Amino acid sequence: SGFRKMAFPSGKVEGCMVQVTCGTTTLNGLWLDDVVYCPRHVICTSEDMLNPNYEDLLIRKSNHNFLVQAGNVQLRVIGHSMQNCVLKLKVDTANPKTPKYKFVRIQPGQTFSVLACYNGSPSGVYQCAMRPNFTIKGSFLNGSCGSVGFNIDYDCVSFCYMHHMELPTGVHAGTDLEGNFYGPFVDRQTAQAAGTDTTITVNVLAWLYAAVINGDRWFLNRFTTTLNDFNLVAMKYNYEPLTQDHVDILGPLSAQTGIAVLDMCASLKELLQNGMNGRTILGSALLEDEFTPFDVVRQCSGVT
Amino acid sequence: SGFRKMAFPSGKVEGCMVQVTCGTTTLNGLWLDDVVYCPRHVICTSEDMLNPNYEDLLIRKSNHNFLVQAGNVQLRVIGHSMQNCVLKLKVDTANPKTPKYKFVRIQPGQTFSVLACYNGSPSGVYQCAMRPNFTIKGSFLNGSCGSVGFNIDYDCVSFCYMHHMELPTGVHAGTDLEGNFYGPFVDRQTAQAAGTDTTITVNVLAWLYAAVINGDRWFLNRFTTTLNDFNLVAMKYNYEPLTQDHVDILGPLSAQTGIAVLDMCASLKELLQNGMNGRTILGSALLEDEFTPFDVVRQCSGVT
Numbered sequence: 001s002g003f004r005k006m007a008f009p010s011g012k013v014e015g016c017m018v019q020v021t022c023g024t025t026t027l028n029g030l031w032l033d034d035v036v037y038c039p040r041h042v043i044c045t046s047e048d049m050l051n052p053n054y055e056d057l058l059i060r061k062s063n064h065n066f067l068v069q070a071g072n073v074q075l076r077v078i079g080h081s082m083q084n085c086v087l088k089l090k091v092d093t094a095n096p097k098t099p100k101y102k103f104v105r106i107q108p109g110q111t112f113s114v115l116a117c118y119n120g121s122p123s124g125v126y127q128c129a130m131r132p133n134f135t136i137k138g139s140f141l142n143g144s145c146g147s148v149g150f151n152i153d154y155d156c157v158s159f160c161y162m163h164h165m166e167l168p169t170g171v172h173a174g175t176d177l178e179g180n181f182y183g184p185f186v187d188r189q190t191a192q193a194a195g196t197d198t199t200i201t202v203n204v205l206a207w208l209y210a211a212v213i214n215g216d217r218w219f220l221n222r223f224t225t226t227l228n229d230f231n232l233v234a235m236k237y238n239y240e241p242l243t244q245d246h247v248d249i250l251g252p253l254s255a256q257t258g259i260a261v262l263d264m265c266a267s268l269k270e271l272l273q274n275g276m277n278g279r280t281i282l283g284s285a286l287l288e289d290e291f292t293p294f295d296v297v298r299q300c301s302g303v304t
Numbered sequence: 305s306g307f308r309k310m311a312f313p314s315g316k317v318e319g320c321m322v323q324v325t326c327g328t329t330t331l332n333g334l335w336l337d338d339v340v341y342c343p344r345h346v347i348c349t350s351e352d353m354l355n356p357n358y359e360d361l362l363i364r365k366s367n368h369n370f371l372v373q374a375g376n377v378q379l380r381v382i383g384h385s386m387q388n389c390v391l392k393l394k395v396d397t398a399n400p401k402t403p404k405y406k407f408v409r410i411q412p413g414q415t416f417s418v419l420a421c422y423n424g425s426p427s428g429v430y431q432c433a434m435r436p437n438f439t440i441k442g443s444f445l446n447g448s449c450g451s452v453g454f455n456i457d458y459d460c461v462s463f464c465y466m467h468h469m470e471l472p473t474g475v476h477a478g479t480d481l482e483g484n485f486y487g488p489f490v491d492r493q494t495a496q497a498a499g500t501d502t503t504i505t506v507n508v509l510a511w512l513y514a515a516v517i518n519g520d521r522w523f524l525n526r527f528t529t530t531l532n533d534f535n536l537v538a539m540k541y542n543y544e545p546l547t548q549d550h551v552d553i554l555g556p557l558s559a560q561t562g563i564a565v566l567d568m569c570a571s572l573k574e575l576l577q578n579g580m581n582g583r584t585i586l587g588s589a590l591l592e593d594e595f596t597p598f599d600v601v602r603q604c605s606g607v608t
């Protein structure tokens with residue numbers, strides 16, 4: 001028993017990290033097969049960042065200007081291309097540590113593990129959620145760009161995020177592995193609105209089920225609610241509206257605990273209206289929304 | 305910027321995990337050089353667990369009774385010995401993925417990363433603290449025994465914990481890699497007192513410094529305190545007494561922020577006496593004690 005903000009084991013991803021330098025800028029790259037993927041802003045100088053013309057900046061670069069190093073050994077770049085906000089550097093050697101992988105675009109509210117890197121070397125791993133407004137609340141310093149987010153299913157790594165930027169508000173923005181930003185963000189040093197965020201209701205409910213499974217049950221009450229009534233409360237508290245698709249996803253947890261989804265909604269409604277009264281749930285004094293229903297089942301069942 | 309409960313990259317440890325089976329029991333083992341380390345209770349049946357005579361139980365086992373598998377390949381056991389609560393199975397092959405390593409005994413209040421495993425395969429990684437009462441609040445199901453806790457400094461993995469047991473209270477207990485339990489615990493299926501725990505004061509202060517570095521400063525006040533006055537409050541609130549050795553350890557964070565340690569103590573005193581008033585610090589509604597001062601500096605400086 002016990003419930004932790006658990007990340008996927010990072011070994012398969014560590015084997016893909018490389019350093020990419022172009023001119024004066026160094027960041028991380030992801031080496032899969034014979035391609036190294038990295039943020040395109042590796043080609044900018046500080047003077048370019050206010051509004052870079054990436055097409056023009058890349059035209060001044062040749063393959064030999066992209067210094068790619070995997071540990072202590074240099075990789076030979078035999079092609080480069082820009083796809084959206086990422087550069088793809090073709091190298092002459094396939095990464096011998098390439099795991100089985102996919103590139104996926106995750107939905108807002110889904111979670112993933114980030115392997116934070118600097119200079120092509122790993123610093124640490126942590127789990128986070130893609131916020132409903134497509135930002136991430138990570139731990140990323142300058143030099144962390146090119147660090148990636150991922151999930152694993154058995155032996156397959158699904159890469160979903162590449163880090164590009166910290167907005168002036170201190171939250172993070174990045175792309176899928178095809179270089180498309182999540183959200184309205186652009187890779188330039190400007191203030192950019194992230195827009196209204198909300199709490200991931202289906203994840204808070206999953207985490208309440210995790211709390212029941214792990215012995216924390218004080219918040220269970222004698223009440224029930226309906227999707228309509230619960231959604232009036234979710235509206236008031238800036239929570240995402242709950243749908244039958246979310247209730248369906250919570251089915252396995254409802255079956256395991258014997259607690260109907262709408263009964264757990266009524267527990268959540270009371271917690272929103274009354275607060276925790278100085279009490280905690282799974283070591284937290286707030287309602288946690290960074291565990292999906294799949295995360296809860298995976299952690300509570302010991303999937304490897 | 306941003307501050308997360310970050311674990312060390314787990315790749316070097318993943319390469320050491322193996323499955324150990326003895327009779328009907330399967331758990332994890334740690335393969336370093338030509339030795340596999342695992343909890344000695346792998347030799348027990350359920351009927352033995354109430355009060356096992358480990359010496360007698362081990363006398364009934366031979367090398368060939370310890371089935372050790374590293375991925376899909378079997379390891380050949382050429383010796384076995386019990387050291388405290390661990391078994392050391394000598395194998396005929398040195399682990400080719402053995403990283404540079406040390407076995408260390410950590411102090412209460414220190415943190416480490418756990419790579420939770422089942423059947424010799426990794427499930428996930430998370431960061432936690434060794435509580436002042438020598439328990440850990442982990443995420444461990446049956447089958448997770450033999451999962452290890454560790455820290456990394458550059459290329460050296462310091463193993464500090466091996467998981468052995470979940471007490472009836474749902475908290476976890478284990479040993480150093482020499483098999484000595486942390487705390488008063490014994491490897492048997494009995495109720496066992498953990499004794500009074502306390503909050504790790506030096507870590508809460510480090511985390512408040514992390515909050516200031518990462519922009520959360522609402523809790524800073526116009527006050528100061530003394531070690532004596534602060535410790536009267538720490539006593540009331542079940543916090544560890546702060547010493548000059550803790551103030552010295554917080555020196556680098558005090559230098560970086562310009563906030564004297566006793567001034568941060570006065571902020572902590574006010575938070576203890578008044579609570580958070582519905583506010584948060586680094587996304588938490590409670591005072592967090594699972595980051596050491598070294599963890600804060602490492603994360604805020606991007607050590608790899």
Ligand SMILES: Cc1n[nH]cc1CC(=O)Nc1cccc(Cl)c1
Pocket residue numbers: 041049140141142143144145164165166167186187188189190305
């Ligand atoms: C401080 C930090 N954390 N994670 C990345 C950074 C550096 C950073 O924000 N770079 C940046 C800023 C604006 C635009 C673009 Cl494309 C990149």
Ligand SMILES: Cc1n[nH]cc1CC(=O)Nc1cccc(Cl)c1
Pocket residue numbers: 001345353444445446447448449468469470471490491492493494
């Ligand atoms: C449920 C769980 N989590 N982590 C380990 C377990 C299984 C467990 O508690 N085993 C156990 C119980 C008593 C004594 C001994 Cl030595 C071992």
